[PDB]
Design a protein around this ligand. Structure first.
Ligand SMILES: *[C@@H]1O[C@H](CO)[C@@H](O)[C@H](O)[C@H]1NC(C)=O
Ligand SMILES: *[C@@H]1O[C@H](CO)[C@@H](O)[C@H](O)[C@H]1NC(C)=O
Ligand SMILES: [Ca+2]
Ligand SMILES: [Ca+2]
Ligand SMILES: [Ca+2]
Ligand SMILES: [Ca+2]
Ligand SMILES: [Ca+2]
Ligand SMILES: [Ca+2]
Ligand SMILES: [Ca+2]
Ligand SMILES: [Ca+2]
Lengths: 276, 542, 48, 276, 48, 49, 48
């Protein structure tokens, strides 16, 4: 592929529809459902995963392709989220107070990222392009930023006194920081509790779909203020009970995955690619 | 005559239907024995009472009962032994309540029209030691009436319930062979079936809300009678082994070869010897008969058990032989070739276009003799033209017709028949009859010919002179157009034309294996055709 | 059109199957478990 | 009509536009306004209905054409909703807690349904296709579901024991159950105070419009998670006083009716077509 | 007209009597005679 | 008792209809006709399964 | 369409009218667009 990536592909506008006769690495695809702990609590059953597997089999998934990854809450799940299956469906319960955290999680898992380590203790860091952000996650991440000028002197802050730095995040399991591009910033972070990386947004993920349970359309997966794209992979439903939500997910799994695309699952389960 | 093979395969599904019920189930001289028998039998009752104070019975059911007696038959005092059992019974129940006090009958058995009464019967007379090999067996008996009698229940408190009434008529319906298990020997016996018909006496239980119930409970079905008697006649025809017209065994407990051999080893030589006495023209006449299942299996003088399962036993053995698997592999190859335009690479064609009939395969190959590639291709193709023979895709009479005719004319003559010999001799005959057989296909006054032996010939119809064999054209012709069995294959045809100058019509008919020209040539005692048909018959050597 | 007679003669081998099924069912037909009505079976107490 | 329903209608692309039929529509039509009790309570006037009728007359409607129906709340209104007039405008107050109930009511009244009885005690019921749902209405509709398998045995539930059933609705006035299609279910419903019907969504009901008073776009009239269509008949307004709401409804009645199509009024006033 | 509980055996019912008649007997006799002729079995006297 | 009004085979048959309609497009034409001339009987039809 | 674009022999037309398989397979092996299209229509018509 690599030696043929930059080669044209020509197709005729009358070619009859067909289906691939190409082997896949795995015989069948796998579906991962990420649900909150409260969903399992409310369902109050030990065999519910088995029943959901049988219903998915009714929907054409061989026994062994559906996996269920439980997560405590949005904040905890936001710490280095791992996407295991070919298709990932994340059932995010909506909370009116965590709109930014929901947006950050959706941005992280609905987009490919290319990240690098940030030794904030040794170097200042810039954001080169609008696609560049600083993604930090951990047990508790507090980020303080001091913008410098061309002479490497803080603006509105003392480069030596951290108390004058600017607070952009306090006790965050995950936070995507966007600062003015082309400006050197001195950073101090709770490195003992969280890791911060310089990340570049490469594009959509296409194999992770987020279903927002309850609420309204509040996700913003783009840091640009004048855009709030509602892609086909961010769905929204209304609910009173979790069994109905899971039945809806099972019954419309074909529609859910028609909005997603295979070929996007990375070899690693991480939500970002890493370079050191 | 080849149709029989096809039909066996076609009907092989019924074989499975047989096995189910079977696994749910568990020279010769004809001598007649019509005997006036008197079956005297009776039932037994199992009355198992439940715990507590004795108000509840756990079961009151039937139990097989044995009886012995002696009666006069044609002035002979004959000692008889019988065993009566019942099947298909209705489990009624009475439930006075949940208390230990209330009358409760957990399960009591009543025989009704849906039940059956089986009676094994045996005596020390001659007829019952000649029934090891039985041609036919049929018994008629006067119906009998079995009435239920009183039976009071042992309650220490209050009124004693009584089980009165109940009656059924036993009517004879079917008699078969059966076995009685003694201590040190085993006896052959006649087992009679009796269908039940409910009768007017209705059985009821006092001290209960039970009345106008019909059947015959197991409580006291004998009604105090010593026995229940039916008088009738049974007709038996026994096959006694005899090798001379002046002797006749008193008893037929003789051992036959199949009582000691399950894999026929020397009967192959019997068949190969029988092949000598085969007429030629009459064999063709028999080969033209559309020998169906009935025609094939009607003329065999079987025993009672053998005729009952001849067709399905033959077919059970038939749907395992190399012929059936070759048919299955051909069908699967055709379905796979039609099912995917993906692996035209895997299959290699010896024709213009790919076809399952025209594919080359393993062919471990024989370096023993210098072999041309064309010979291997033609042999591989002919080995499937055999399945063309057995796929109704032929025009003239085929080698399978001759094989079936030989099979029939041999099985009828062969004195070795048994429920296990006819299987594996029909199937193995179809497998091993005429192994080296040739085929021809005609196209634009030119004949192509192939053989399983690897011999191929191209020639012209008007004059029999050989032509450079054009493989990739014989293959395209043979995949679609009618294929003709080479009964009078090229070499014989050329010999005949050179010595016995045959007409255009005669050559036309001989090429297409028309039966009429074949039989007319045989009737003229023409040495060449007689020799060819002799070779074909001797090839039917099993 | 005359195939009815030919097929009746040919398929006659299944009469043996029919006879075996008939005579094996009577050998091994299960006892029928007859139900009882919703209104059942109470009686008097044992009275002396 | 029926003998010409399956016949083509041919029209030329130059036929002159006819004059405005809005006046004729208003003259020969009737308008039904559905409002909650709190609206009347806040207005606190005994002649506000007459005032609104006179204002509608100023807007062209004849005197006795506008009718006003009052419902206690969304949950109360959802029990056998009755749509009377040719045009049915429903002023639905927004509550962040009743989101699913708002969506269910809108789905029921903004669409045409074809319903049949269900004898849950006798037969096992399945949903044939994506258009098939189970609509339950009553004083208290508590629906519990036990999916079965090919052998009729339950999965995650026991048919004999109802306590193991997967509860999907509890203490509901209206609920629209969507279970996995093609799977037979055994249902436990409080038939004493509930009626459940097997319904098929035929299509839009264009003579019913819903104006959501307050909140954001939360209505979801489609069980499919991947789509949440906002139709022309799903209006939303922001309010402080109910009088302003009614004045907006009166003034823009032209636009409200123009978003609705007549001839969709059934002979009966029910929200569904009942068939035996 | 299919009096049900009899269609369960109608074909076999007719076949069981069909394989007993003069037609079936003649077919079997002809087949046996053809087999005998193919086998050179001595045919009866006066048979020409 | 309780009777399943709509049989359990409906969903399986629907999925198999989908599979068959998907498989139709991958049929060779010459070999399909070659198969069509085979007198497909009971044994041949139900043996390769 | 065949006789116009692919004017066929008397024998070929005779056999095609009578749906003889030989000529069908002949035309398919030649890769005839018209007969191939017809057979494709039939096969895609074979859905359930
Ligand atoms: C000997 O066998 C051959 C063929 O095996 C047969 O033609 C011939 O009639 C048999 N007997 C005699 C006496 O020729
Ligand atoms: C339609 O409008 C025109 C323009 O005012 C008017 O002249 C005409 O009478 C109206 N009515 C009809 C039926 O065209
Ligand atoms: Ca955050
Ligand atoms: Ca500062
Ligand atoms: Ca930036
Ligand atoms: Ca934005
Ligand atoms: Ca509700
Ligand atoms: Ca459960
Ligand atoms: Ca559904
Ligand atoms: Ca939706």
């Amino acid at each position: 592929q690599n030696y043929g990536i930059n080669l044209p592909i020509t197709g005729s506008m009358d070619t009859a529809y067909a289906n691939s006769t190409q082997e896949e690495t795995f015989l069948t695809s796998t579906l991962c459902l990420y649900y909150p702990t409260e969903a399992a609590t409310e369902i109050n059953d030990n065999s519910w995963k088995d029943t959901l597997s049988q219903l998915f089999l009714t929907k054409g998934w061989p026994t062994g392709s559906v996996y269920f990854k439980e997560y405590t809450d949005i904040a905890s799940f936001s710490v280095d989220p791992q996407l295991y299956c070919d298709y990932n469906v994340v059932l995010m319960k909506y909370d009116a107070t965590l709109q930014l955290d929901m947006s950050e999680l959706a941005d992280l898992i609905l987009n490919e990222w290319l990240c690098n380590p940030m030794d904030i203790t040794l170097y200042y860091y810039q954001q080169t392009d609008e696609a560049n952000k600083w993604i930090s996650m951990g047990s508790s991440c507090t980020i303080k930023v001091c913008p410098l000028n061309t002479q490497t002197l803080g603006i509105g802050c003392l480069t030596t006194d951290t108390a004058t730095f600017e607070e952009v995040a306090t006790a965050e399991k995950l936070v995507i920081t966007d600062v003015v591009d082309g400006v050197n910033h001195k950073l101090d972070v709770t490195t003992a509790t969280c890791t911060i990386r310089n990340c570049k947004k490469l594009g959509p993920r296409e194999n992770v779909a987020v279903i927002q349970v309850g609420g309204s359309d509040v996700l913003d997966i783009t840091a640009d203020p004048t855009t709030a794209p509602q892609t086909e992979r961010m769905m929204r439903i209304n609910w009173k009970k979790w069994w109905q939500v899971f039945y809806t997910v099972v019954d419309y799994v074909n529609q859910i995955i028609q909005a997603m695309s295979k070929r996007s699952r990375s070899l690693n389960s991480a939500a970002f690619y890493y370079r050191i | 005559a080849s149709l029989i093979y096809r039909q066996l395969l076609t009907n092989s599904y019924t074989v499975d239907l047989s096995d189910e019920i079977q696994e749910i189930g568990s020279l010769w001289k004809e001598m007649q024995y019509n005997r006036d028998i008197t079956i005297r039998f009776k039932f037994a009752s199992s009355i198992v009472k439940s715990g507590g104070l004795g108000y509840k019975w756990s079961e009151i059911s039937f139990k097989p009962a044995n009886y012995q007696y002696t009666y006069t038959r044609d002035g002979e005092e004959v000692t008889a032994h019988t065993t009566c059992s019942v099947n298909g019974m209705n489990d009624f129940n009475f439930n006075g309540g949940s208390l230990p006090t209330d009358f409760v009958i957990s399960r009591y058995e009543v025989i009704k029209e849906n039940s059956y009464v089986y009676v094994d019967y045996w005596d020390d007379s001659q007829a019952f030691r000649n029934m090891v090999y039985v041609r036919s067996l049929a018994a008629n008996l006067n119906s009998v009436i079995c009435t239920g009698g009183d039976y009071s229940f042992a309650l220490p408190v209050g009124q004693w319930p009584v089980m009165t009434g109940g009656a059924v008529s036993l009517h004879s319906a079917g008699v078969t062979l059966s076995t009685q298990f003694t201590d040190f020997v085993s006896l052959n016996s006649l087992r009679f079936r009796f269908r039940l018909t409910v009768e007017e006496p209705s059985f009821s239980i006092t001290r209960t809300r039970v009345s106008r119930l019909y059947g015959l409970p197991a409580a006291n079905p004998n009604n105090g009678k010593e026995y229940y008697e039916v008088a009738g006649r049974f007709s038996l025809i026994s096959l006694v082994p005899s090798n001379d017209d002046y002797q006749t065994p008193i008893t037929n407990s003789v051992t036959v070869r199949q009582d000691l051999e399950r894999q026929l080893g020397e009967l192959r030589e019997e068949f190969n010897a029988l092949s000598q006495e085969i007429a030629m023209s009459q064999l063709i006449d028999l080969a033209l008969l559309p020998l169906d299942m009935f025609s094939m299996f009607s003329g065999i003088k079987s025993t009672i058990d053998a005729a009952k399962s001849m067709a399905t036993s033959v077919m059970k053995k038939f749907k395992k032989s190399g012929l059936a698997n070759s048919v299955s592999t051909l069908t699967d190859s055709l379905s796979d070739a039609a099912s995917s335009i993906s692996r035209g690479a895997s299959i290699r064609s010896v024709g213009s276009s790919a076809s399952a009939w025209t594919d080359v395969s393993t062919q471990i190959t024989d370096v023993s003799s210098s072999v041309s590639s064309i010979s291997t291709q033609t042999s591989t193709i002919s080995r499937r033209l055999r399945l063309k023979e057995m796929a109704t895709q032929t025009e003239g009479m085929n080698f399978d017709d001759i094989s079936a005719a030989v099979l029939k004319t041999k099985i009828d003559r062969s004195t070795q028949i048994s429920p296990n010999t006819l299987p594996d001799i029909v199937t193995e005959a179809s497998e091993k009859f005429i192994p080296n057989r040739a085929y021809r296909v005609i196209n634009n006054d030119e004949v192509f010919e192939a053989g399983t032996d690897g011999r191929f010939f191209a020639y012209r119809v008007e004059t029999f002179d050989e032509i450079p064999f054009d493989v990739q054209k014989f293959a395209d012709l043979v995949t679609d157009s009618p294929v003709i069995s080479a009964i009078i294959d090229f070499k014989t045809l050329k010999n005949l034309n050179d010595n016995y100058g045959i007409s255009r019509q005669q050559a036309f008919n001989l090429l297409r294996s028309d039966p009429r020209v074949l039989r007319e040539f045989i009737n003229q005692d023409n040495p060449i055709i007689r020799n060819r048909i002799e070779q074909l018959i001797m090839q039917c050597r099993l | 059109a005359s195939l009815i007679y030919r097929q009746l003669l040919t398929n006659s081998y299944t009469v043996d199957l029919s006879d075996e099924i008939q005579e094996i069912g009577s050998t091994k037909t299960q006892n029928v478990t007859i139900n009882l009505g919703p209104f059942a079976q109470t009686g008097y107490a044992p009275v002396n």
